[PDB]
Chain A
């Protein structure tokens, strides 16, 4: 199979600037290269086919170029409705074997905002059920890259947390992030100190929020 590579996978851009998205193929696909735009919860939208031809109804600020293995999508002046994910796709040899790139997401550039960290112990209503969940909230930060480390009695946790991150907020373009440490009831009662440690670009040092089980 032909491997399409879209590097970088994210670009932080502002309205009005010229943005360039890159596409690389593992072998020559000539000009048989298409570009799609996708917004969350919506079907993909054809932007470009045959490497450089604009699809029907596509505004002139989108333009494709390149050949063989190297391809480029240019938005000459970015508009606010252009923030989406962009996929390239080859369709070269006859027995179809169509493949897509993994996507390049355009995100709104803003100033660095440090997260506000909040930790939530399990509720007694949940504790009676036989499962305990600790929630670490990282609120209104930018950029997207943040690390949450869990420590249970000052020992690093592995494989028992799940993370979830909002889209960019429609007002301030920040992100929020939850980390849920999920433990069995017995394991939760066996330890005292529960902590999440947050490292982010807007923090000068790691932020730790902790509690001792049973306040």
Chain B
């Protein structure tokens, strides 16, 4: 099968450097042009860089020009992107994509048909931090019909991700785990909520299980009615 595989992304302090690599297999890599395309969290695709098959022409989007450097090594079937002066807006999933087919120098485009799986670059001055887990306690302000809402606030952690289950997996009905938001602190934060019958609160125990594998944090938080 035709295959593109990236790696090299990770946590970089602001103004730092990082070098991404994309290795190809299954096709003649030396006759294809190559692209780097990135995607900011919650945003659309942005083209970043082009390199011709011969390495003769290298072109850049204006948002990265002067700071980034594309290169390739056809012997190792490799494409490289050097990122310098990294900023928080450069935080993205970076993809390498196949471009024009140039047998004997005669290029034909056919679209960006083969993509890699993407490598994630996170630019933050934050450090690895386990989350604080606070209860969103059910009360009359979160009981409406016959349904109570309760939850857990998984606040101030870095990096992504965390996993949240309820009652060690026994509770899945009506569970909503929100996408993480990036706070001004550079730390992430999310909430996990569940709706239960309100007449269950005095008798059923609700525990959220938060796990943050980057740090060494495994929390079981009992959420009790207020």
B9 within 8 A of A: no
Contacts of B134 in A (CB 8 A): 122-123, 125-126, 133
Q: Which of A112-158 contact B (CB under 8 A)?
A: 116-123, 125-126, 129, 133, 135, 137, 139
A1 CB to nearest B CB, Å: 7
Q: Which of B180-195 contact A (CB under 8 A)?
A: 180-181, 183, 189-191, 193, 195
Contacts of B62 in A (CB 8 A): 1
A43 within 8 A of B: yes
User: CB-CB contacts of A91-130 with B at 8 A, as 1s and 0s?
Assistant: 1000111111111000000000000111111110110010
A89 to B225 Cα, complex, angstroms: 52
Are B155 and A133 interface neighbours, CB within 8 A?
A: yes
A91 to B189 Cα, complex, angstroms: 39
Selected contact of B176 from candidates A103, A122, A139, A180, CB within 8 Å: A139
Are A164 and B35 interface neighbours, CB within 8 A?
A: no
Selected contact of B137 from candidates A87, A123, A129, A180, CB within 8 Å: A123
Are A99 and B136 interface neighbours, CB within 8 A?
A: no
User: CB-CB contacts of B192-226 with A at 8 A, as 1s and 0s?
Assistant: 01010000000000000000000000000000001
A49 within 8 A of B: yes
Contacts of B110 in A (CB 8 A): 49
A210 to B140 Cα, complex, angstroms: 10
User: Taking A101-B44, A118-B144 as contacts, is the C-beta distance between A44 and B95 under 8 angstroms?
Assistant: yes
A142 to B44 Cα, complex, angstroms: 24
A121 to B136 Cα, complex, angstroms: 8
Contacts of B117 in A (CB 8 A): 43
B208 CB to nearest A CB, Å: 13
Selected contact of B46 from candidates A45, A100, A121, A137, CB within 8 Å: A100
User: Taking A44-B95, A87-B45, A96-B59 as contacts, is the C-beta distance between A139 and B193 under 8 angstroms?
Assistant: yes
User: CB-CB contacts of A30-56 with B at 8 A, as 1s and 0s?
Assistant: 001010101000011110111000011
Q: Which of A154-176 contact B (CB under 8 A)?
A: 162-166, 176
User: Taking A56-B113, A87-B45, A178-B193 as contacts, is the C-beta distance between A133 and B149 under 8 angstroms?
Assistant: no
A100 to B45 Cα, complex, angstroms: 6
Are B46 and A55 interface neighbours, CB within 8 A?
A: no
A209 within 8 A of B: yes
A95 to B145 Cα, complex, angstroms: 62
Are B191 and A49 interface neighbours, CB within 8 A?
A: no
B132 within 8 A of A: yes
Contacts of A116 in B (CB 8 A): 144-145, 147, 149, 195
A72 to B59 Cα, complex, angstroms: 29
Are B135 and A125 interface neighbours, CB within 8 A?
A: yes
Contacts of B135 in A (CB 8 A): 123, 125
Contacts of B111 in A (CB 8 A): 34, 46, 48-50, 55
Are A118 and B149 interface neighbours, CB within 8 A?
A: yes
Contacts of B37 in A (CB 8 A): 44
User: Taking A98-B35, A135-B136, A139-B176 as contacts, is the C-beta distance between A119 and B95 under 8 angstroms?
Assistant: no
User: Taking A100-B45, A176-B193 as contacts, is the C-beta distance between A95 and B179 under 8 angstroms?
Assistant: no
Are B181 and A164 interface neighbours, CB within 8 A?
A: yes
B118 within 8 A of A: yes
Are A91 and B109 interface neighbours, CB within 8 A?
A: yes
User: CB-CB contacts of B122-161 with A at 8 A, as 1s and 0s?
Assistant: 0000000000101111010110110101010101000000
Q: Which residue of B lies closest to A32 (CB)?
A: B109
A19 to B113 Cα, complex, angstroms: 23
A48 to B112 Cα, complex, angstroms: 10
19 contacts between A and B (CB under 8 A): A1-B62, A38-B45, A43-B115, A44-B45, A46-B111, A48-B111, A49-B109, A55-B113, A56-B113, A96-B59, A118-B142, A119-B141, A121-B141, A129-B132, A137-B151, A139-B149, A164-B180, A164-B181, A166-B177
In the A-B complex, list the 3 residue pairs whose CB atoms are closest, starting with the nearest.
Answer: A49-B111, A118-B142, A98-B47
- 13 further contact pairs, Cβ within 8 A, besides A118-B144, A121-B226: A55-B111, A87-B44, A89-B47, A100-B45, A100-B47, A118-B149, A120-B141, A133-B155, A137-B142, A137-B193, A139-B193, A182-B183, A209-B141
